[PDB]
Amino acid sequence: KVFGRCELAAAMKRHGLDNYRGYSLGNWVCAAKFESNFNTQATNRNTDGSTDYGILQINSRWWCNDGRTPGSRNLCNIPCSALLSSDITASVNCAKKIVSDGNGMNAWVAWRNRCKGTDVQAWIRGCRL
Numbered sequence: 001k002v003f004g005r006c007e008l009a010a011a012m013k014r015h016g017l018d019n020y021r022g023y024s025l026g027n028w029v030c031a032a033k034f035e036s037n038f039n040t041q042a043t044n045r046n047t048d049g050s051t052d053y054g055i056l057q058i059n060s061r062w063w064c065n066d067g068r069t070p071g072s073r074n075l076c077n078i079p080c081s082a083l084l085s086s087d088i089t090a091s092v093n094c095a096k097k098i099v100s101d102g103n104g105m106n107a108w109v110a111w112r113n114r115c116k117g118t119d120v121q122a123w124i125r126g127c128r129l
């Protein structure tokens with residue numbers, strides 16, 4: 001599923017991501033935009049052989065099981081495929097664990113490079129929330 005901007009902002013808010021670990025909703029929408037262009041079916045293969053999955057491009061090195069990332073963990077206790085669902089519940093639940101890990105949203109290199117320090121409220125501007 002390709003979410004609309006305000007559609008994804010609403011789904012994230014309903015799943016409690018708005019101000020989670022102090023990150024306003026526009027931070028999460030901005031990260032999703034640059035990670036996946038709001039596509040739940042987004043995938044990216046890393047040089048190390050791990051894969052990033054879903055709207056927030058969560059990686060198999062630590063967070064999900066895909067059966068093909070030697071030495072990896074599954075800290076979110078999910079198959080990586082769950083991160084590609086039209087239902088963002090698994091992606092949100094796992095994002096909450098990631099952002100709690102110590103480095104906040106720096107865990108998402110695209111957030112640090114493209115969202116951090118910008119006017120992220122523009123990503124929820126005009127949305128009925």
Ligand code: NA
Binds near residue numbers: 061066069074
């Ligand atoms: Na894994």
